Design brief:
The PDB classes it as unknown function. The structure is a homotrimer. By secondary structure, chain A is mostly beta strands. Chain A has helices at 18-21, 156-159, 251-259, and strands spanning 3-8, 22-26, 39-42, 57-64, 70-77, 93-94, 190-191, 202-203, 263-264, 266-267, 280-283, 293-300, 311-316.
Chain lengths: 318, 318, 318
């Protein structure tokens, strides 16, 4: 049991003095509303570590000494702090390598003959946009007049692409891939009582759907699902906004976002590195209404003076 | 001095093992924005308490052993949690018995010949709506074109019925009764120094009205009160939204909601159970500008390993 | 080293018993969104200090005993609290003397021939408005149709005058003067390592502009700056709202509000009283990318049982 780390800087970030002078770490794997985020805390002997390149690519490997290190991601430095008497730092770093916190704010609008989530990310984001090679494997028949009027281009994925017209979208910024949820890639795990430090296995019935109904064009109708993984309920009818042709099948989007809050674990673990936001967990060795699949929201790998606390949050993956 | 409790489950919630395995409690009596809320914390001897019926009616009685227990309310379980090493629970439960967190989201719109707060709750909520037998004793002449366009039916009480067109409304979800404030029922009390644990007797002059002026139909006028329980002020003119015929007398609504923040106590007590959100307090035994009536906002009855902390918050009841 | 204080009440607030019975203090010097704020904490020997005049003018002097006291400001009491067993108070007080938390809510609209920030504060706020003698030294050619439709008159400075059409505005409520930033008055200082208790020297690249582009009238164009004190960037294009003639030069407003978050120190000091929101700091004796000018956001002078903690926050003053 001995954690180690390899911070590949690919240049003159610091002259590999980060191996000597770390104090803590955090990580994330967030599909929702944010990217990943390194944190560093670096000593000073009255000034030894210069302010690094704000926009330097960092490659991070974690794991134990005497074991092969896991793929952890690649990062680019955005924000920097300092401290008082101990002279700390917080060299934080976000996901995208070729584009970090710059050159992503070129927006526009699309025409009617644009197949959505093909002509939005595969066919539109390759012409020097937010993050180029990310793709969506949804290729449904979409010939609706659709455009971003004026949205921030990382909120333009949210107001029209990957939250409202999601139908389960991930928009995970690292590794340049925004997929859907419910397990596009075959990765199971097994957890028990003899692995886990703590829990928060919550449940909500404020956010139970029983039906999901949407809105259509004015010349206004609705198409609904009738079993949101529950048979104990009869009727719930909720509406937020209108639509033209997008919510003809995007009632499946609200099947997720209310039932993702229906069951949510938050369990702490010592260091594995076998934990990502696209993998499902089989929480074995628990009580009656807990055992089952859970899609992992976020994994928070940390160093400290204590070790690893890889906090894993999840949603109800049915 | 010995607190006791009777949790009547009226079914197979748990087989009365809750009498053996509690750890804490909370309660509320909230007129504003929420219902009441039980909390429970229940042991596990590596799994003894199964996950209860999410929607089981619970009747709660509190008080001391050797005294008659007080009416505390009836509750239906919505949310459930867990914990780490000690294996806790939070079996929380909201107000309404026949309708808890389900089957309340059927909305609609009304016509012009609808007397407001009679044809809204007495004459509209009896046809299988949010919570059926709750009534409003305001029967004023209201022949205005009024309708909910699309509101959540518990926010439809707030955006159009019991906050904007309130004139003092309570909308207290337990016991199926949403009344007005300023004491429709004759219940006084007396408190002193020898009863109370702590205080927070706040005051605000950021939210002092001196007049209250509203808006009318376009073919726009205003009718105002000139003494919001103060004579030290001269002029304050505030407007938020327009109205058709509702704010002809709903300038009395803003007389409350700014002067409810004018004086607000928050005093802790040991266990009584004689404290509800509809009762006025006479805080005797205090300083000069404190003694007087106070309508109770919320009462928070708790168990612990310490005992009772019945936190009582109030507003300025003039 | 002995802090002293002179609370000039100019009347029968308390009979100078505040010199005997204080416990703590806070102050502010906030240009943004708030005024200054005293706090007091006053003992009770079961009731000795009556509730003071809510609207009594207080003059505050601070500094050390044996030194001339500094100008700290004048204040008017608004909010009051109490406490539990120790019987505290929080006699808080805001900036304006002639107008505190009252008689400031008279609004209106202006015509086309109104030179902005002359006919808005110098030529409009002298007719019994929010705070009378405050002035703006910006006298640019503004013949645009401009009016407040219905804004709160302290938000009417924010939605149209000193945040959106700011171009660096301060709107500092004490001493009746709302100026622009970037040092209209010649006041430098020098700080080092041997003066300062702690730090938070943050940086942000989420809020870096590279260009700043605005919007115009419909018969829509843009005029932009191309160097927001950076040469490491190439293109950032951000838009929020349209304009008629105001954002012809108000692209300089967004040059500040994004680069004010680009560098932000927050350093604690023992008591000086030589620190105001309009003064620039020269943080000497530090590392490479820290040394330079910093416009002070806010100074927080406090008493305690420990002494002074004059927390000084700043922005990047280029």
């Amino acid at each position: 049991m001995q954690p180690s780390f390899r911070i590949v800087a690919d240049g003159t970030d610091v002259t590999q003095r980060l191996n000597d002078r770390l104090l803590k770490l955090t990580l994330l794997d967030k599909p929702g509303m944010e990217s990943d985020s390194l944190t560093l805390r670096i000593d000073d002997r009255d000034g030894q570590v210069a302010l690094p390149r704000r926009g330097a690519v960092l490659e991070v490997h974690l794991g134990y000494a005497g074991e092969p290190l896991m793929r952890m991601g690649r990062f680019t430095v955005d924000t920097l702090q300092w401290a008082g008497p101990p002279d700390c730092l917080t060299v934080t770093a976000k996901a995208g390598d070729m584009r970090g916190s710059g050159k992503t704010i070129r927006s526009g609008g699309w025409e009617g003959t644009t197949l959505a989530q093909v002509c939005r990310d595969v066919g539109a984001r390759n012409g020097w946009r937010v993050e180029c090679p990310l793709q969506v494997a949804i290729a449904r028949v979409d010939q609706v007049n659709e455009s971003d009027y004026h949205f921030v281009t990382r909120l333009a994925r949210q107001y029209d692409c990957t939250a409202k017209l999601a139908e389960g979208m991930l928009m995970v910024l690292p590794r340049q891939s925004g997929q859907s949820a419910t397990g596009r890639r075959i990765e199971p795990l097994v957890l028990g009582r003899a692995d886990v430090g703590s829990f928060d296995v919550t449940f909500d019935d404020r956010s139970l759907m029983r039906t999901v109904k949407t809105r259509y064009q004015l010349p206004v109708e609705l198409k609904n699902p009738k079993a949101p993984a529950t048979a104990m309920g009869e009727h719930v009818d909720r509406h937020l906004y209108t639509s033209r042709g997008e919510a003809e099948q995007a009632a499946k989007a609200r099947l997720a976002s209310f039932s993702r809050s229906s069951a949510s674990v938050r369990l702490e673990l010592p260091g594995r590195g076998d934990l990502f936001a696209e993998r499902s967990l089989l929480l074995q060795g628990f009580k009656a209404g807990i055992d089952g699949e859970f899609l992992i929201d976020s994994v928070e790998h940390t160093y400290s003076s204590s070790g690893w606390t890889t906090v894993v949050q999840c949603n109800g993956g049915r």
